[PDB]
Amino acid sequence: HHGEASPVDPLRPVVDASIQPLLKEHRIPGMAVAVLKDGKAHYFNYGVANRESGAGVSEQTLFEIGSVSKTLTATLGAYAVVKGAMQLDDKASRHAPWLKGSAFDSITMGELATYSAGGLPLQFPEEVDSSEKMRAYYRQWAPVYSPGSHRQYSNPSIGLFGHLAASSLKQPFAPLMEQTLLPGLGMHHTYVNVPKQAMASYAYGYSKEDKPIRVNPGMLADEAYGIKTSSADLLRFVKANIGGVDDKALQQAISLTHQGHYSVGGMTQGLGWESYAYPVTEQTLLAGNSAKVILEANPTAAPRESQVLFNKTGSTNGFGAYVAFVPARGIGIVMLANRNYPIEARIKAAHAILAQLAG
Ligand SMILES: Nc1nc2c(ncn2[C@@H]2O[C@H](COP(=O)(O)O)[C@@H](O)[C@H]2O)c(=O)[nH]1
């Protein structure tokens, strides 16, 4: 492209300098990046969304965001709190009579949401592939740790929280999310189930062997890791987490997702969101998002006292996402890739970009 005008956005060189080495190094087919600064959204797009169509990534491209979905699930849950349909200290079996008689008689909704129920695993056992088998699994589950004592990052945990939260509101999760929560968040290009009308915008994910893949149906996938969104919509969510929204209940729910419950090292666990004192060292940010924190059980420590950075990683077999933002500084970043590349790479690059945005 020698002789073409270079893009005019003065933030382009900052983003490029961090993102282009990322795409080359881990051979990422496409990434949509969106950045907030001084009340304005800046979109930077790289590569291709679908190798069959050759279509370039844009801020309208739909990516799987994996566990970033948990921030939306948690917001739905907080929304049920605000509406009075549940409290975080409710026993889980209050909201599901099929749970009465089990350990979930003594486990709170809050503990489900914050992966501190007592050692629920990261994933369902593979044989748990139906709603009936799911119910059986929960009723027979044996607590490993006492409730509240340990964080074990778990899809069955926040998955069940999302599920009972929607049950408290007398609506199935996916319609509730798409019809009430997401439109209130201004997220009109975000889906649990991507409709016919929007499929052409849906990227393919790409495995380590460069095979085109999309997320597999699994139990409570909708609740735990099943959202598809664009970088523009996700930046609207960042903005909603900073400036707020017009729906009064949704506004409260957003604030509730920021409230800390406990900490692990420098990370403080909120509802969905994980938070850090800002400015935050790269090492601290990497530690909070490390294999140790993600994969193994960690003891719960006292939460950080209520400036702050909020963040969440998301991954599926073919996608890698990350979002971080600092409300006190009006800055944020959304990075959505159609390849599941290392979390450490995501944090380092976001780290770097946010630091230059902070000025
Ligand atoms: N070893 C292992 N890693 C997982 C499993 N599920 C997700 N991960 C990884 O854990 C990290 C965090 O997931 P995320 O929070 O980004 O969805 C990602 O690197 C993701 O690929 C799993 O079942 N086993």
CSV table of C-alpha atoms in Angstrom, one decimal, residues 3-324:
chain,number,residue,atom,x,y,z
A,3,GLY,CA,1.7,5.8,-1.7
A,4,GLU,CA,-1.7,5.5,0.0
A,5,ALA,CA,-2.6,8.0,2.8
A,6,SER,CA,-1.9,6.6,6.3
A,7,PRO,CA,-5.0,6.5,8.5
A,8,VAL,CA,-5.7,9.9,10.3
A,9,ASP,CA,-6.6,8.6,13.8
A,10,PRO,CA,-3.7,9.7,16.1
A,11,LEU,CA,-4.3,6.6,18.2
A,12,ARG,CA,-3.7,4.2,15.3
A,13,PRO,CA,0.1,4.1,15.8
A,14,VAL,CA,-0.3,3.2,19.5
A,15,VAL,CA,-2.7,0.4,18.9
A,16,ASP,CA,-0.8,-0.9,15.8
A,17,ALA,CA,2.5,-1.0,17.7
A,18,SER,CA,1.0,-3.4,20.3
A,19,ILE,CA,-1.4,-5.4,18.1
A,20,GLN,CA,0.5,-6.1,14.8
A,21,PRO,CA,3.3,-8.1,16.5
A,22,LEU,CA,0.5,-10.0,18.2
A,23,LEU,CA,-1.2,-11.0,15.0
A,24,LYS,CA,2.1,-12.1,13.4
A,25,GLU,CA,3.6,-13.9,16.3
A,26,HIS,CA,0.5,-16.1,17.1
A,27,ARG,CA,-0.7,-16.2,13.5
A,28,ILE,CA,-4.1,-14.6,14.3
A,29,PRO,CA,-6.5,-14.6,11.3
A,30,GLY,CA,-8.4,-11.5,12.4
A,31,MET,CA,-8.9,-9.1,15.3
A,32,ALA,CA,-11.3,-6.3,16.0
A,33,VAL,CA,-10.0,-3.7,18.5
A,34,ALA,CA,-12.0,-0.9,20.1
A,35,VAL,CA,-10.6,1.7,22.4
A,36,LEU,CA,-12.3,4.4,24.5
A,37,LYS,CA,-10.7,7.7,25.2
A,38,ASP,CA,-12.2,11.2,26.1
A,39,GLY,CA,-15.7,9.9,25.4
A,40,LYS,CA,-15.0,8.7,21.9
A,41,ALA,CA,-14.8,5.1,20.5
A,42,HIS,CA,-11.9,4.3,18.1
A,43,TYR,CA,-12.1,1.1,16.0
A,44,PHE,CA,-9.0,-0.6,14.6
A,45,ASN,CA,-9.5,-3.8,12.5
A,46,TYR,CA,-7.1,-6.4,11.3
A,47,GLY,CA,-7.1,-9.4,9.0
A,48,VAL,CA,-10.0,-11.6,8.1
A,49,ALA,CA,-13.2,-12.8,9.8
A,50,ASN,CA,-13.9,-15.8,7.5
A,51,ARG,CA,-11.3,-17.4,5.3
A,52,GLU,CA,-14.0,-18.7,2.9
A,53,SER,CA,-15.5,-15.3,2.1
A,54,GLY,CA,-12.2,-13.4,2.5
A,55,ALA,CA,-14.2,-10.7,4.3
A,56,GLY,CA,-12.2,-8.3,6.5
A,57,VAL,CA,-12.8,-7.9,10.2
A,58,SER,CA,-14.8,-4.8,11.1
A,59,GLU,CA,-16.4,-3.4,14.3
A,60,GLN,CA,-19.6,-5.0,13.0
A,61,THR,CA,-18.0,-8.5,12.9
A,62,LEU,CA,-19.4,-11.0,15.4
A,63,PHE,CA,-16.9,-12.9,17.5
A,64,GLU,CA,-17.4,-15.4,20.2
A,65,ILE,CA,-16.3,-13.8,23.4
A,66,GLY,CA,-16.3,-17.0,25.6
A,67,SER,CA,-16.1,-16.3,29.3
A,68,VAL,CA,-16.5,-12.5,28.8
A,69,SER,CA,-20.1,-13.7,28.6
A,70,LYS,CA,-19.9,-14.1,32.4
A,71,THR,CA,-19.9,-10.3,32.9
A,72,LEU,CA,-23.3,-10.2,31.0
A,73,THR,CA,-24.6,-13.2,32.9
A,74,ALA,CA,-23.6,-11.5,36.2
A,75,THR,CA,-25.3,-8.3,35.1
A,76,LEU,CA,-28.5,-10.3,34.5
A,77,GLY,CA,-28.1,-11.8,37.9
A,78,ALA,CA,-27.6,-8.3,39.5
A,79,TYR,CA,-30.6,-7.2,37.6
A,80,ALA,CA,-32.7,-9.8,39.4
A,81,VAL,CA,-31.3,-8.6,42.7
A,82,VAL,CA,-32.2,-5.0,41.8
A,83,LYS,CA,-35.7,-6.1,40.8
A,84,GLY,CA,-36.2,-8.0,44.1
A,85,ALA,CA,-36.5,-11.5,42.5
A,86,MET,CA,-33.5,-12.8,44.4
A,87,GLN,CA,-30.8,-11.8,46.9
A,88,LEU,CA,-27.2,-12.8,46.6
A,89,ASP,CA,-27.4,-14.5,50.1
A,90,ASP,CA,-30.4,-16.7,49.0
A,91,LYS,CA,-29.6,-20.4,49.2
A,92,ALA,CA,-29.5,-21.7,45.6
A,93,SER,CA,-32.3,-24.3,46.3
A,94,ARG,CA,-34.7,-21.4,47.1
A,95,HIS,CA,-34.8,-20.9,43.3
A,96,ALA,CA,-34.9,-24.5,42.1
A,97,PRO,CA,-37.0,-27.0,44.0
A,98,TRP,CA,-35.1,-29.9,42.3
A,99,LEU,CA,-32.1,-28.8,44.3
A,100,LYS,CA,-33.8,-29.1,47.7
A,101,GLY,CA,-32.2,-31.8,49.8
A,102,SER,CA,-28.7,-31.3,48.3
A,103,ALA,CA,-25.6,-29.3,49.2
A,104,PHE,CA,-27.1,-26.3,47.4
A,105,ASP,CA,-29.4,-26.0,50.4
A,106,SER,CA,-26.4,-24.4,52.1
A,107,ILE,CA,-24.8,-22.6,49.2
A,108,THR,CA,-25.6,-19.0,48.3
A,109,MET,CA,-26.4,-17.5,44.9
A,110,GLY,CA,-23.4,-15.2,45.5
A,111,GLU,CA,-21.1,-18.1,46.1
A,112,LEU,CA,-22.3,-19.6,42.8
A,113,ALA,CA,-21.6,-16.3,41.0
A,114,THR,CA,-18.1,-15.9,42.4
A,115,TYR,CA,-17.0,-19.6,41.9
A,116,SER,CA,-16.7,-20.0,45.7
A,117,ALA,CA,-19.4,-22.6,46.3
A,118,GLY,CA,-16.8,-25.2,47.3
A,119,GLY,CA,-14.9,-26.7,44.4
A,120,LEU,CA,-17.2,-27.0,41.5
A,121,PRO,CA,-14.9,-27.9,38.5
A,122,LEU,CA,-14.0,-25.6,35.5
A,123,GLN,CA,-16.1,-27.8,33.2
A,124,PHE,CA,-19.0,-30.2,33.4
A,125,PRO,CA,-17.9,-33.9,33.2
A,126,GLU,CA,-18.3,-34.8,29.5
A,127,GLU,CA,-21.1,-37.3,30.2
A,128,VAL,CA,-23.3,-34.4,31.5
A,129,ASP,CA,-25.0,-33.5,28.2
A,130,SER,CA,-28.7,-33.0,29.0
A,131,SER,CA,-30.7,-30.9,31.4
A,132,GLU,CA,-31.7,-34.2,33.1
A,133,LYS,CA,-28.1,-35.3,33.5
A,134,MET,CA,-27.2,-31.8,34.6
A,135,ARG,CA,-29.7,-31.9,37.5
A,136,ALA,CA,-28.4,-35.3,38.6
A,137,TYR,CA,-24.9,-34.0,38.6
A,138,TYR,CA,-25.6,-31.1,40.9
A,139,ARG,CA,-27.6,-33.2,43.3
A,140,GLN,CA,-24.8,-35.7,43.7
A,141,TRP,CA,-21.9,-33.2,43.8
A,142,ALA,CA,-19.8,-33.4,46.9
A,143,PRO,CA,-18.4,-30.1,48.2
A,144,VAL,CA,-14.6,-30.1,48.3
A,145,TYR,CA,-14.2,-27.0,50.4
A,146,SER,CA,-16.5,-25.1,52.7
A,147,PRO,CA,-18.6,-22.5,51.0
A,148,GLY,CA,-16.8,-19.1,50.6
A,149,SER,CA,-13.3,-20.4,51.4
A,150,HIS,CA,-11.9,-21.0,48.0
A,151,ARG,CA,-12.1,-19.7,44.4
A,152,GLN,CA,-12.3,-22.4,41.8
A,153,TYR,CA,-13.1,-20.8,38.4
A,154,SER,CA,-16.1,-22.8,37.2
A,155,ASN,CA,-18.6,-22.8,34.4
A,156,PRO,CA,-21.0,-25.1,36.3
A,157,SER,CA,-20.9,-22.5,39.2
A,158,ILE,CA,-21.6,-19.2,37.4
A,159,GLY,CA,-23.7,-21.2,34.9
A,160,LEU,CA,-26.0,-22.3,37.6
A,161,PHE,CA,-26.1,-18.8,39.0
A,162,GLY,CA,-27.2,-17.4,35.6
A,163,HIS,CA,-29.8,-20.2,35.3
A,164,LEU,CA,-31.5,-19.7,38.7
A,165,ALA,CA,-31.3,-15.9,38.2
A,166,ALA,CA,-33.4,-16.2,35.1
A,167,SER,CA,-35.6,-18.7,36.8
A,168,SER,CA,-36.2,-16.1,39.6
A,169,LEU,CA,-37.3,-13.7,36.9
A,170,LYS,CA,-39.7,-16.3,35.4
A,171,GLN,CA,-38.1,-16.2,32.0
A,172,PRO,CA,-35.6,-18.5,30.2
A,173,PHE,CA,-32.1,-17.2,30.1
A,174,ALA,CA,-31.6,-16.6,26.4
A,175,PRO,CA,-34.8,-14.6,25.7
A,176,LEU,CA,-34.3,-12.7,28.9
A,177,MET,CA,-30.8,-11.8,27.8
A,178,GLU,CA,-31.6,-10.9,24.2
A,179,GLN,CA,-35.0,-9.2,24.9
A,180,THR,CA,-34.4,-7.3,28.2
A,181,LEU,CA,-30.8,-7.0,29.2
A,182,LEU,CA,-28.9,-6.5,26.0
A,183,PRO,CA,-31.2,-3.9,24.5
A,184,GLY,CA,-31.1,-2.0,27.8
A,185,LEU,CA,-27.3,-2.0,27.5
A,186,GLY,CA,-27.5,-0.6,24.0
A,187,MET,CA,-26.2,-3.9,22.6
A,188,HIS,CA,-28.4,-4.4,19.6
A,189,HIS,CA,-25.7,-6.5,17.8
A,190,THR,CA,-25.2,-9.0,20.6
A,191,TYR,CA,-26.7,-12.5,20.8
A,192,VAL,CA,-26.9,-15.7,22.7
A,193,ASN,CA,-28.2,-17.2,19.4
A,194,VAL,CA,-27.1,-15.5,16.3
A,195,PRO,CA,-30.2,-15.0,14.1
A,196,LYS,CA,-30.4,-15.7,10.3
A,197,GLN,CA,-30.3,-11.9,9.7
A,198,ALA,CA,-26.9,-11.6,11.4
A,199,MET,CA,-25.1,-14.9,10.4
A,200,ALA,CA,-23.1,-13.3,7.6
A,201,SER,CA,-21.4,-11.1,10.2
A,202,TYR,CA,-20.5,-14.1,12.4
A,203,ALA,CA,-16.7,-14.9,12.1
A,204,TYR,CA,-15.3,-18.4,12.0
A,205,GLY,CA,-12.9,-19.3,14.8
A,206,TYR,CA,-9.7,-21.0,13.9
A,207,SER,CA,-8.0,-23.8,15.9
A,208,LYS,CA,-4.3,-24.3,16.4
A,209,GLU,CA,-4.4,-26.4,13.1
A,210,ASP,CA,-6.1,-23.6,11.3
A,211,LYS,CA,-9.4,-25.5,11.0
A,212,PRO,CA,-12.6,-23.3,11.0
A,213,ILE,CA,-14.6,-23.9,14.2
A,214,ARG,CA,-17.4,-22.4,16.2
A,215,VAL,CA,-18.4,-23.0,19.8
A,216,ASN,CA,-20.0,-26.4,20.7
A,217,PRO,CA,-23.4,-26.6,22.4
A,218,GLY,CA,-22.9,-27.6,26.0
A,219,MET,CA,-24.9,-27.5,29.3
A,220,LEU,CA,-25.3,-23.9,30.5
A,221,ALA,CA,-23.2,-22.7,27.6
A,222,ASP,CA,-25.6,-19.7,27.2
A,223,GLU,CA,-24.9,-18.7,30.8
A,224,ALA,CA,-21.2,-19.4,31.0
A,225,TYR,CA,-19.5,-18.7,27.6
A,226,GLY,CA,-22.0,-18.4,24.8
A,227,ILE,CA,-22.4,-14.7,23.8
A,228,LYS,CA,-21.4,-13.5,20.3
A,229,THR,CA,-20.8,-9.7,19.9
A,230,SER,CA,-18.9,-7.1,18.0
A,231,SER,CA,-16.2,-4.8,19.3
A,232,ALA,CA,-18.5,-1.8,18.9
A,233,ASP,CA,-21.2,-3.4,21.1
A,234,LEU,CA,-18.7,-4.6,23.7
A,235,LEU,CA,-17.3,-1.0,23.9
A,236,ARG,CA,-20.9,0.2,24.4
A,237,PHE,CA,-20.9,-2.2,27.4
A,238,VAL,CA,-17.7,-0.7,28.7
A,239,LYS,CA,-19.3,2.7,28.3
A,240,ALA,CA,-22.4,1.5,30.2
A,241,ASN,CA,-20.0,0.4,33.0
A,242,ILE,CA,-18.6,3.9,33.1
A,243,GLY,CA,-21.3,6.5,32.3
A,244,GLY,CA,-24.3,4.3,33.0
A,245,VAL,CA,-27.6,3.7,31.1
A,246,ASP,CA,-31.1,5.0,31.1
A,247,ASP,CA,-32.9,2.0,32.6
A,248,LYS,CA,-32.8,2.7,36.4
A,249,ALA,CA,-32.7,-1.0,37.4
A,250,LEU,CA,-30.0,-1.9,34.9
A,251,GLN,CA,-28.0,1.1,36.2
A,252,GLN,CA,-28.0,-0.3,39.7
A,253,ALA,CA,-27.2,-3.8,38.4
A,254,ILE,CA,-24.1,-2.5,36.7
A,255,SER,CA,-22.9,-0.9,39.9
A,256,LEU,CA,-23.6,-4.1,41.8
A,257,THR,CA,-21.3,-6.1,39.4
A,258,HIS,CA,-18.4,-3.9,40.5
A,259,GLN,CA,-18.8,-4.5,44.2
A,260,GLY,CA,-15.9,-6.7,45.5
A,261,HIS,CA,-16.5,-10.0,47.3
A,262,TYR,CA,-13.0,-11.3,48.0
A,263,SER,CA,-9.5,-11.1,46.6
A,264,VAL,CA,-6.9,-13.6,45.3
A,265,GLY,CA,-3.5,-11.8,45.3
A,266,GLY,CA,-3.9,-8.4,43.6
A,267,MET,CA,-7.2,-9.5,42.0
A,268,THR,CA,-10.6,-8.7,43.5
A,269,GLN,CA,-13.6,-10.8,42.5
A,270,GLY,CA,-16.8,-8.9,41.6
A,271,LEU,CA,-19.8,-10.3,39.8
A,272,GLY,CA,-18.3,-11.4,36.5
A,273,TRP,CA,-15.8,-8.5,36.5
A,274,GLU,CA,-12.4,-9.0,38.1
A,275,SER,CA,-10.8,-5.8,39.4
A,276,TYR,CA,-7.4,-4.2,40.4
A,277,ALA,CA,-6.2,-1.1,42.0
A,278,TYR,CA,-5.1,1.3,39.2
A,279,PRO,CA,-2.5,2.0,38.1
A,280,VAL,CA,-1.7,-1.7,38.0
A,281,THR,CA,1.7,-3.3,37.3
A,282,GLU,CA,1.9,-5.7,34.3
A,283,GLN,CA,3.0,-8.4,36.7
A,284,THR,CA,0.0,-8.0,38.9
A,285,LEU,CA,-2.3,-8.0,35.9
A,286,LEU,CA,-0.6,-11.2,34.6
A,287,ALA,CA,-0.8,-12.8,38.0
A,288,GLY,CA,-4.5,-12.3,38.4
A,289,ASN,CA,-5.0,-13.8,35.0
A,290,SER,CA,-2.5,-16.6,35.4
A,291,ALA,CA,-2.9,-20.4,35.1
A,292,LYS,CA,-2.7,-20.6,38.9
A,293,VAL,CA,-5.7,-18.3,39.4
A,294,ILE,CA,-7.7,-19.8,36.4
A,295,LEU,CA,-7.0,-23.5,36.9
A,296,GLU,CA,-6.5,-24.2,40.6
A,297,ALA,CA,-8.4,-23.5,43.8
A,298,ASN,CA,-7.2,-20.5,45.6
A,299,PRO,CA,-8.1,-19.4,49.2
A,300,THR,CA,-10.4,-16.3,49.4
A,301,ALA,CA,-8.8,-13.2,51.0
A,302,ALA,CA,-10.4,-9.9,52.0
A,303,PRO,CA,-11.6,-7.8,49.1
A,304,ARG,CA,-9.9,-4.6,48.1
A,305,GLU,CA,-11.6,-1.5,49.6
A,306,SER,CA,-14.0,0.3,47.3
A,307,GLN,CA,-9.2,4.2,41.2
A,308,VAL,CA,-9.9,0.8,39.6
A,309,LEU,CA,-9.3,-1.3,36.5
A,310,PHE,CA,-11.9,-3.9,35.6
A,311,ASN,CA,-11.2,-6.7,33.2
A,312,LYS,CA,-12.3,-10.1,31.9
A,313,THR,CA,-10.8,-12.7,29.6
A,314,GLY,CA,-12.8,-14.9,27.3
A,315,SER,CA,-11.8,-18.0,25.3
A,316,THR,CA,-13.4,-20.7,23.2
A,317,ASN,CA,-11.7,-23.3,21.0
A,318,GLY,CA,-11.5,-20.8,18.1
A,319,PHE,CA,-11.7,-17.4,19.7
A,320,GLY,CA,-9.8,-15.2,22.2
A,321,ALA,CA,-11.2,-12.1,23.8
A,322,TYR,CA,-10.3,-9.5,26.4
A,323,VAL,CA,-11.8,-6.3,27.8
A,324,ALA,CA,-10.5,-3.9,30.3
